[PDB]
Amino acid sequence: SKPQPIAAANWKCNGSQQSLSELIDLFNSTSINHDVQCVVASTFVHLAMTKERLSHPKFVIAAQNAIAKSGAFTGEVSLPILKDFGVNWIVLGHSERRAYYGETNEIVADKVAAAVASGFMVIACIGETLQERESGRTAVVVLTQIAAIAKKLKKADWAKVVIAYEPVWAIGTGKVATPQQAQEAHALIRSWVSSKIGADVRGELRILYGGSVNGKNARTLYQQRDVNGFLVGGASLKPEFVDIIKATQ
Amino acid sequence: SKPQPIAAANWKCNGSQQSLSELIDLFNSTSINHDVQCVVASTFVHLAMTKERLSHPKFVIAAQNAIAKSGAFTGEVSLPILKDFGVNWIVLGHSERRAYYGETNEIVADKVAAAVASGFMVIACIGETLQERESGRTAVVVLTQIAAIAKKLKKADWAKVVIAYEPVWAIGTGKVATPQQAQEAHALIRSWVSSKIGADVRGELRILYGGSVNGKNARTLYQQRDVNGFLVGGASLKPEFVDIIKATQ
């Protein structure tokens, strides 16, 4: 029925050597019996630790970002670096970066294209803000976003890409997002891929939900056709992240 | 006289485990016999490796940037996350940050204020573009920048500040900045500290030169009354860096 689920933990701009250890021991000791890809996206600074600490065979490490070329860009970290370092997963185009870091669709397509081409598994993020949503621009918005990334990939390139649909509109505006709402957004994406690339890609594609996921609503979300996992913010710094993996079958 | 110099290595967004290892080794084995403070600004990802390896008593680790607080900033690293990790030195306001990352005078200033609170040791960056110099906007430009830093500072805080003047008008414009030219700009900044904060601070202040330096030209520059060391780009990856330290005369 569904492709391999992913359980993605987005640690953001948080952490501490002591706290992150604790969790790592917890994750490690978790028992997972089903086919699931677990991913821990940590700050660049903590990659080393998580890298040589995560014992769990169901878990890989991710970078929350990068640039495509090494060079003169003080403060930044590129793919070549990451690649040498031993990280083959990366999250790009997250709403937080889109919002405060200059990240345009044109910029996200380039990062993505760069990453894939250099070998990386990518969790390319997309989603519409409350503004776009209320003004009836959800379909124009997501299709544009996913169109832009597509414009750079070849059909074969899809094997390296995952999509995380973020309900920006419902991310800290005081709104809720129902599973029927998630589903529609996912369904859009699925559709477009199916229609513009091939049903063969579409059926293999993973579309993650990047909204507000906790231990309770994890399953009700997963229970929906086009929800192939999650990209978790808050509950990923917490033990309930384990519940989140369990909820993916 | 002059205060304690700083020979600082901004590796920017570059390196592999190998090369960094070798470089560091050379650094580890270099007998620096004078009073200088050597600094190593590596990428976030290499902070770990550098931390573990840099044995030299005269060397200190530094990060190329950060944001003030922790939280929802996908892809970003915060003053707390660095502190925890052991990093107490920071380069803030770098030219390439100002140009391609929308870090304004206010941003830079804020970060600066932040890091100083957190008990960091900051090397804050200022400089005019070629456009600006060309139109004789040097003084307005360089002073506006330093002024923005000062507004947020307490007289005491100055003890943690290190000023780095980057002749951006010289960087990759087919321009050569002469010791004479450097000194004028360093002398200007000193003028402003001395006026504004007090002669005592001015006299203690360490104003670095962040233009294109190397084994040859380093000598001459440091000779200038108001240049208290260097913020090196390219050669900070090479064995010339050694030479540059020793140009600290």
Please check whether residue A171 is in contact with residue A95, taking contact to mean a CB–CB distance below 8 angstroms: yes
Gap between the Cα atoms of A62 and A94, Å rounded: 13
Instruction: Select the residue of B41, B44, B72 nearest A45 (Cβ to Cβ).
Output: B44
Please check whether residue A74 is in contact with residue B101, taking contact to mean a CB–CB distance below 8 angstroms: no
Please check whether residue A227 is in contact with residue A210, taking contact to mean a CB–CB distance below 8 angstroms: no
Residue B10 in marked binding region: yes
Instruction: Select the residue of A46, A74, A82 nearest B65 (Cβ to Cβ).
Output: A74
Q: Which residues pair with B6 in a beta bridge?
A: B37, B229
Gap between the Cα atoms of B239 and B6, Å rounded: 17
What is the homologous superfamily of the domain A1-249 according to CATH?
A: Aldolase class I (3.20.20.70)
CA B24 to chain centre: 19
In chain A, the residue whose alpha carbon lies closest to the alpha carbon of B71 is A13
In chain B, the residue whose alpha carbon lies closest to the alpha carbon of A99 is B73
Number of Cβ within a 10 Å radius of residue A156: 9
Q: Which residues of A are catalytic?
A: 94, 166
- Enter the tokens of residue A9: 């933990």
Closest CA to A11 of A64, A66, A49, A77: A64
Please check whether residue B231 is in contact with residue B212, taking contact to mean a CB–CB distance below 8 angstroms: no
Closest CA to A89 of A11, A8, A27: A8
Residues after which a C–N gap over 2.5 Å breaks chain A:
none
What does each C-alpha distance from A151 to A154, A202, B138 come to in angstroms?
8, 16, 43
Chain A hits for B82, CB-CB cut-off 8 Å, are 45
Number of H helices, E strands in chain A: 11, 8
Asked if B34 is an active-site residue, the reply is no
In chain B, the residue whose alpha carbon lies closest to the alpha carbon of A69 is B13
Please check whether residue A206 is in contact with residue A228, taking contact to mean a CB–CB distance below 8 angstroms: yes
Do B96 and A102 lie within an 8 Å CB cutoff?
no
Closest CA to A78 of A94, A65, A91: A65
Closest CA to A222 of A201, A243, A196: A243
What does each C-alpha distance from A46 to A25, A75, B173 come to in angstroms?
15, 16, 37
Tell me the nearest-neighbour CA distance from A190 into chain B, angstroms: 26
Chain B hits for A82, CB-CB cut-off 8 Å, are 45
> Per-residue b/e over A179-217, b at no fewer than 16 CB within 10 Å?
bebbbebbebbbebbbeebeeebbeebbbbbbbbbebee
Do B65 and A77 lie within an 8 Å CB cutoff?
no
Please check whether residue B206 is in contact with residue B234, taking contact to mean a CB–CB distance below 8 angstroms: no
Please check whether residue B247 is in contact with residue B208, taking contact to mean a CB–CB distance below 8 angstroms: no
Q: Which 3 state secondary structure label does DSSP give B199?
A: helix
What does each C-alpha distance from A148 to A8, A106, A144, A225, B68 come to in angstroms?
23, 7, 6, 25, 33
Residues 145-174 of chain B whose Cβ lies under 8 A from any Cβ of chain A: none
What is the DSSP secondary-structure string of B88-137? -EEEES-HHHHHHS---HHHHHHHHHHHHHTT-EEEEEE---HHHHHTT-
Please check whether residue A127 is in contact with residue A95, taking contact to mean a CB–CB distance below 8 angstroms: yes
Tell me the nearest-neighbour CA distance from B65 into chain A, angstroms: 5
- Selecting among B103, B166, B186, B240, the annotated active-site residue is B166
The resolution in angstroms reads 2.8
The structure was resolved experimentally with X-ray
H-type helices in chain B, by residue range? 17-28, 47-53, 79-85, 95-100, 105-117, 130-134, 138-150, 179-196, 199-204, 218-222, 240-246
Gap between the Cα atoms of B161 and A154, Å rounded: 50
Q: Which 3 state secondary structure label does DSSP give A163?
A: strand
Delimit the domains of chain A by residue range.
1-249
Rounded to 10 degrees, the C-alpha dihedral A77/A81/A85/A89 comes to 70
Gap between the Cα atoms of B92 and B67, Å rounded: 10
Gap between the Cα atoms of B173 and B190, Å rounded: 27
Do A12 and B102 lie within an 8 Å CB cutoff?
no
Which residues are CB-contacts of B202 (< 8 A; sequence separation ≥ 6)?
B190, B193, B194
Q: Which 3 state secondary structure label does DSSP give A39?
A: strand
Do A77 and B44 lie within an 8 Å CB cutoff?
yes
